[PDB]
Design a protein around this nucleic acid. Structure first.
Ligand code: MG
Ligand code: MG
Ligand code: ZN
Ligand code: ZN
Ligand code: ZN
Ligand code: ZN
Lengths: 162, 162
DNA sequence: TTGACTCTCTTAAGAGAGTCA
DNA sequence: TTGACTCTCTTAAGAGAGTCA
């Protein structure tokens, strides 16, 4: 809600509820041939999810609280960042999973950044493979690698140069 | 169905037309602090675009040819790949700009790959900065770098471990 | 046969809001 | 007030198809 006190109360209630979500250990590539371990706090697969939480999409949830007799509702991963600017360079700030695990609500696995920055982590080589993200990745992106390109650049004639 | 000879004729007419597009020299980052040069063959900003070409969206075009009284139409960047498989690993193949310049139709600046592979090139460090794409990038991706993350991982209490 | 427009759709990283009990 | 559902939207890398002369 509007007051700083009320927003802190929202963040604190959220953390306490998510803190009781099952803690699931995931071993992850870090880049550089190394492996690490993340502890994700995973929202349940089906109702009930936890006080204040409801599913609005297969991998989408919202957190809701009643404040001043009014319902206030947020995307379930946005709550840690309610005191942060909601835009950057004219781009919307998004909740971004460093663990690349949608069900996880561990705020130690979340950052707040443009959708482009968010997406780009999918291909990051990782914290031991060359990550240059200023807010560092926790793991190599799941899509990092050589790709599976079917056909490369080519011409039949002689009209083009690189 | 069009014979492979008819398909080659389509590719050849496309190349002949695109080859006459304005050729624009662009200096680009390669990664590793190095700079290179790409020569993009850029479709005009407004009609007329070239024989066979029409705009279906702000940065979308199509190529159309009529053969034996049947109108055939393709996405304007897909024509170089008409003799290639159109999917891989159960994913549709997409035209992917190695120069990251949508108006460019130089086939030496295009490859044919999944949309995920395509997107990921936006963040690639580039051919002199650590690119691991098997079909190598021509330049560092425009979105490579430290990012502009507004807030990193954080908690107010002690409910969480990383 | 051709040009110049029109419309909606896909994907996978993210969102907001309404209907009932 | 709280829970459990429903629906459509945003973005930026890509698509197919219709109308008219
Ligand atoms: Mg993400
Ligand atoms: Mg691309
Ligand atoms: Zn996690
Ligand atoms: Zn990174
Ligand atoms: Zn180009
Ligand atoms: Zn690359």
């Amino acid at each position: 809600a509007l007051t700083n006190a009320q927003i802190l109360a929202v963040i604190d209630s959220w953390e306490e509820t998510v803190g009781q979500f099952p803690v699931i250990t995931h071993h992850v590539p870090l880049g550089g041939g190394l492996q690490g371990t993340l502890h994700c706090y995973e929202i349940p697969l089906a109702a009930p999810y936890g006080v204040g939480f409801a599913k609005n999409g297969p991998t989408r949830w919202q957190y809701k609280r009643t404040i001043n007799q009014v319902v206030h509702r947020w995307g379930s991963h946005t709550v840690p960042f309610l005191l942060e600017p909601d835009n950057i360079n004219g781009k919307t700030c998004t909740a971004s999973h460093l663990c690349h695990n949608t069900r996880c609500h561990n705020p130690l696995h979340l950052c707040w950044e443009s959708l482009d920055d968010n997406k780009g982590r999918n291909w990051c080589p990782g914290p031991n493979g060359g990550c240059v993200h200023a807010v560092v990745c926790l793991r190599q992106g799941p899509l990092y690698g050589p790709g599976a390109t079917v056909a490369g650049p080519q011409q039949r004639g002689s009209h083009f140069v690189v």
